[PDB]
Amino acid sequence: GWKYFKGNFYYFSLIPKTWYSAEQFCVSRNSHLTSVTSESEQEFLYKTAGGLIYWIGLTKAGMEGDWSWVDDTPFNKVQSARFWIPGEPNDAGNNEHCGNIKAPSLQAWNDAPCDITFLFICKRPYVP
Ligand SMILES: CO[C@H]1O[C@H](CO)[C@@H](O)[C@H](O)[C@@H]1O
Ligand SMILES: [Ca+2]
């Protein structure tokens, strides 16, 4: 039940997991929690999400707490500013170190506590 979009397959989970347990599940399926690197990808993801919240590959790295992609796609702070929900990341309780797709819009991302369970999206490259 993987959905194909532009050289990648995506898995929209039916079971909710914590950010890391979801990531482990993806890694066990030769994938990672999805990065988002274009407007068309963001749009594909939030429309497929159908108004439900899904963990994606957003998580903090380094001492400064910069956001990063768990699949090691370099995080482009400038080019991703448009993808956050207005007001996010707000870091609530000083404990929101992972990211999900929340709002059904281009401005979709929210930071949430990593140990909260949500549905999740894996991303797997297609290699011909
Ligand atoms: C109540 O907290 C929730 O809503 C705020 C926005 O008000 C988000 O930033 C936060 O991560 C939670 O999802
Ligand atoms: Ca938040």
Numbering used by the authors: 198 to 325
Direct quotes from the study:
Langerin, a C-type lectin on Langerhans cells, mediates carbohydrate-dependent uptake of pathogens in the first step of antigen presentation to the adaptive immune system. The extracellular portion of langerin contains a C-type carbohydrate recognition domain (CRD)2 that binds sugars and a neck region that mediates formation of trimers stabilized by a coiled-coil of α-helices.
To investigate the structural basis for the reduced binding of mannose-containing structures to the Asp-288/Ile-313 variant, the structure of this form of the CRD in complex with α-Me-Man was determined. The position of the side chain of Lys-257 remains the same in the presence of either aspartic acid or asparagine at position 288, and it does not have appropriate geometry to form hydrogen bonds with the side chain at position 288. Interactions with both backbone and side chain oxygen atoms of Asp-308 form a key part of the Ca2+-binding site. However, this form of langerin shows much weaker binding of the fucosylated blood group antigens and high mannose structures that are bound by wild type langerin and langerin-I313. Under the usual screening conditions of 2 mm CaCl2, the signals are lower, although the pattern of ligands bound is similar, with most significant binding to the GlcNAc-terminated ligands (data not shown). These results are consistent with previous experiments showing that the change of Asn-288 to aspartate results in a decrease in the affinity of the carbohydrate recognition domain for Ca2+ and thus a decrease in sugar binding affinity.
